[PDB]
Design a protein around this ligand. Structure first.
Ligand SMILES: NC(=O)c1ccc[n+]([C@@H]2O[C@H](COP(=O)([O-])OP(=O)(O)OC[C@H]3O[C@@H](n4cnc5c(N)ncnc54)[C@H](OP(=O)(O)O)[C@@H]3O)[C@@H](O)[C@H]2O)c1
Ligand SMILES: COc1cc2nc(-c3nccs3)n(-c3ccc4c(N)nc(N)nc4c3)c2cc1OC
Length: 157
């Protein structure tokens, strides 16, 4: 299976200055649970933003940099390389990767951040005419998670 994982706000903002615009621990937990034991494919900028490979999953980084060789990370240099990766593959970001892969993925696990943030990077537009809502679950709010959010699982019709 080839899936997208993304958190985007009401206007599809996904990032600002190479970081998440919001602090939402529950989104990170959501992503951890979905991807543990599986594969993440991310662009070079997203990788450098996180700063280290995430434990207990395969970390694959897409970059044109032939000097890229980081411990605990596998490197690919083409979009086509993604299709040769076994198991459940998750497209992990960022904007460029999402734009390249939205037409290619089986499904999407979206965290809709129910707010309007300042962004410099965006998830591409999509329509529910193309995507079936497999599930929609309202995120629980507490002291550490104060922004309303909804976990959507969308499957291409
Ligand atoms: N909200 C979310 O779910 C989420 C998740 C992840 C990231 N983000 C955000 O997204 C933003 C980053 O997005 P971005 O588009 O600027 O960067 P990005 O997608 O993370 O990485 C872009 C880089 O990936 C490499 N790349 C992409 N396609 C390639 C291809 N076909 N062949 C070879 N290399 C390729 C290139 O690396 P080289 O220049 O090294 O060649 C390119 O510069 C940040 O703000 C981050 O916080 C948000
Ligand atoms: C150390 O723990 C984490 C740190 C993280 N930093 C990030 C950053 N995102 C953008 C810039 S940095 N995340 C990420 C990375 C990708 C995500 C995606 N595709 N989708 C969703 N929903 N959340 C993400 C969180 C992270 C996810 C993490 O745990 C899973």
């Amino acid at each position: 299976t080839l899936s997208i994982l993304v958190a985007h706000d009401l206007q599809r903002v996904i990032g600002f200055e190479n970081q998440l615009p919001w602090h939402l621990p529950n989104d990170l937990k959501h992503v951890k649970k979905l991807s543990t034991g599986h594969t993440l494919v991310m662009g070079r900028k997203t990788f450098e933003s996180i700063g280290k490979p995430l434990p207990n999953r395969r970390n694959v980084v897409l970059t044109s940099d032939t000097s890229f060789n980081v411990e605990g990370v596998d490197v690919i240099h083409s979009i086509e390389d993604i299709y040769q990766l076994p198991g459940h593959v998750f497209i992990f970001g960022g904007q460029t990767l999402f734009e390249e892969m939205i037409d290619k993925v089986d499904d999407m696990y979206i965290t809709v951040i129910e707010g309007k943030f300042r962004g410099d990077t965006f998830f591409p537009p999509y329509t529910f005419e193309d995507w079936e809502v497999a599930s929609s679950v309202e995120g629980k709010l507490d002291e550490k998670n104060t922004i309303p959010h909804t976990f959507l699982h969308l499957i291409r019709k």
